Amino acid sequence: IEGFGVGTWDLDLKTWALDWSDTARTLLGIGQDQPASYDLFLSRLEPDDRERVESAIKRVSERGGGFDVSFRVAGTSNAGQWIRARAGLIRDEAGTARHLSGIFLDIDEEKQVEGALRTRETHLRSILHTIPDAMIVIDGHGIIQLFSTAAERLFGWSELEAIGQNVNILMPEPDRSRHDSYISRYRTTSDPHIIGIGRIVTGKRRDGTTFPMHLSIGEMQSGGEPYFTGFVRDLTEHQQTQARLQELQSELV
Amino acid sequence: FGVGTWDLDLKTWALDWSDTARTLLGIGQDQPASYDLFLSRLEPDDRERVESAIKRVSERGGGFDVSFRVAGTSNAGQWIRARAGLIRDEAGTARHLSGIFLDIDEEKQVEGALRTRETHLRSILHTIPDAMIVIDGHGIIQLFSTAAERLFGWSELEAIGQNVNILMPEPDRSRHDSYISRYRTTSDPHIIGIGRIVTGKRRDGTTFPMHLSIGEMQSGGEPYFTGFVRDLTEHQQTQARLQELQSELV
């Protein structure tokens, strides 16, 4: 109760009387000496979560319940206090549903973690759509997990077509049949042949046509499994320009 | 229902918890509420760190939260955040300790997902062949790839926080902040979508032909742009060789 760090509160469906903790007063940004009031509790809230609050108290009134709703208050000028109000029902007897008691939780840090994840996901999508090189992400066994827009244009598969399939569908033989062992050999020996180095190889479209590409791989670890992020650059025009360079310099020579 | 409730009074060392509280702990529902039973659900290294925490809160004053996982239900553990405070019987005697049990399995999944995305962001930043740069709505560098460091000669910690205009010659340098500013109001892109060959400037002072590709995104009321920069210094080496060789024919 002293230094608890969590607010507590009470509200009765009949007589609408409310008593919150002193730790709860600070969370609402008001109440230095003034008394607890449910109308005052409304005043601190912004007028969207308001209607969701009485919708919640009407929902928990009906037969049963469970009460948890989240909101932000205007405590400070350029910041908001995010609070998750959680509560449970206690009936007097078999007769009616009397006062509902609960807690106020400070969920500033949880919402901060939320937004950070949301930003990272949004940004990952932008990287996938914008990157000029074809970006492919596989798991420890070569199973495509992400497939960039450039990769779609280059290999002729869509993201939904490619994600879940083995990365060896992108390459001709013998590399297609050997690519699983390439990954397994790397994982046991830790001796890289393309990671950090880079290699020009031949990639294969869904058409069946083949094209010269530069491959670059980087590794990561998540939940006990590695993931490999590949970057593919189409060298079909680069060696086409080299084919121009060598044959045009022949008629000079 | 709601979250679980419990109290462990320091006087008489008893402990009682609510009906939703015991389901969170994985209580067999025959067992009664005892403090030695609570410590039997926790895993060994968690156990001692919990018991380290109560010893640090044995000092009269304050509050107590710990997070842990019990694992006997689904092969993936149940995460609980146990938060508690003190009440005092008299002026100098602390008697009861009352608090709550919070299911936080969702809170730990978002943590892990964020961790994975952050790890993958670092992997891309190290590995992408083109220079990747990320700016906010005002042109301040927020992320700076390894390839960008090698191309522009600034370090990540040097570049981040600085305006992106330090990467380009004049007059683009002085005009770049207007370019972003006009784009934000008008929404008419000139490089977003299209892809422009421009000239960039290293910290050296030297310049080079680069290709710029920009992608937009929105987060927290501010746009962010991700620039992909490719050096064309060897591409135009071959283009100059092609131009000289086919001009020597005519």
Ligand code: HEM
């Ligand atoms: C699409 C055409 C591709 C071809 C032809 C190809 C070919 C190869 C070859 C030949 C090796 C082994 C080199 C050696 O042992 O001498 C290799 C290794 C490997 N590749 Fe692929 N690859 C392709 C795409 C990818 C992509 C897109 C990824 C990841 C997203 C990837 C992941 C790996 C990994 C993890 C290894 C083992 C690590 C290493 O040897 O450094 N490959 N690849």
Ligand code: HEM
């Ligand atoms: C380093 C050398 C760079 C140069 C020389 C350069 C040049 C330019 C120019 C000339 C424009 C205006 C186009 C016009 O009005 O016709 C522009 C716009 C823009 N640039 Fe830069 N840029 C550079 C780097 C970057 C990077 C790395 C990013 C992103 C991280 C970026 C973000 C933007 C944005 C958001 C716009 C406005 C939207 C648009 O017009 O597409 N710039 N840039």
